[PDB]
Amino acid sequence: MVLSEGEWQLVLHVWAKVEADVAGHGQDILIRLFKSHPETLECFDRFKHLKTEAEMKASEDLKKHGVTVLTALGAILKKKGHHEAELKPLAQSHATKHKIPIKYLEFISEAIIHVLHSRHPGDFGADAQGAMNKALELFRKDIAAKYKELGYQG
Numbered sequence: 001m002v003l004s005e006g007e008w009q010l011v012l013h014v015w016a017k018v019e020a021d022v023a024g025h026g027q028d029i030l031i032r033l034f035k036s037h038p039e040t041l042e043c044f045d046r047f048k049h050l051k052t053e054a055e056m057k058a059s060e061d062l063k064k065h066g067v068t069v070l071t072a073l074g075a076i077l078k079k080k081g082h083h084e085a086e087l088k089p090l091a092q093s094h095a096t097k098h099k100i101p102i103k104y105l106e107f108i109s110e111a112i113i114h115v116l117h118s119r120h121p122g123d124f125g126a127d128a129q130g131a132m133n134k135a136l137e138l139f140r141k142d143i144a145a146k147y148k149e150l151g152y153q154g
């Protein structure tokens with residue numbers, strides 16, 4: 001994959017909006033993931049009992065984890081594909097400790113796209129959606145290659 005500089009700019013321009021309310025984006029993303037693909041909730045021992053959207057919005061622990069996820073993702077996107085150093089510790093933990101399959105990274109990618117549409121209509125048009133899709137796909141493909149370098153099938 002090779003994104004155009006334009007595509008990267010579309011990505012980073014919408015990312016600036018995410019940065020204006022990182023915790024709100026993070027909550028909405030994790031909640032949308034858990035709603036759309038409930039099996040994913042089982043991966044979080046401390047959260048896995050939460051039932052309703054309002055319950056999840058009140059979890060300080062879920063909100064903190066959202067920030068943690070989006071901070072790491074932000075640093076990776078800003079590398080414009082030159083993210084081997086940032087991916088390594090993340091592949092390590094997600095392959096070996098959390099045991100997350102690549103398909104669940106696909107599920108969270110869908111949730112990111114939904115939330116960006118939900119919070120930023122007018123500024124998340126087809127072109128920005130396409131560029132964000134491509135950046136997230138690159139991320140997932142590169143993680144999957146890292147898993148295999150560690151000897152794991154993601």
Ligand code: HEM
Nearest residue numbers: 040043044068069072073089090093094098100104105108
């Ligand atoms: C954009 C995609 C993702 C990013 C950037 C991301 C990032 C992170 C970061 C930075 C951490 C803490 C440090 C670490 O353990 O490596 C973490 C922990 C974790 N991640 Fe992810 N992650 C993503 C997707 C997922 C998905 C889809 C799942 C499960 C469905 C998952 C499950 C977990 C779990 C279980 C932990 C440990 C949580 C805790 O006990 O506090 N991750 N992730």
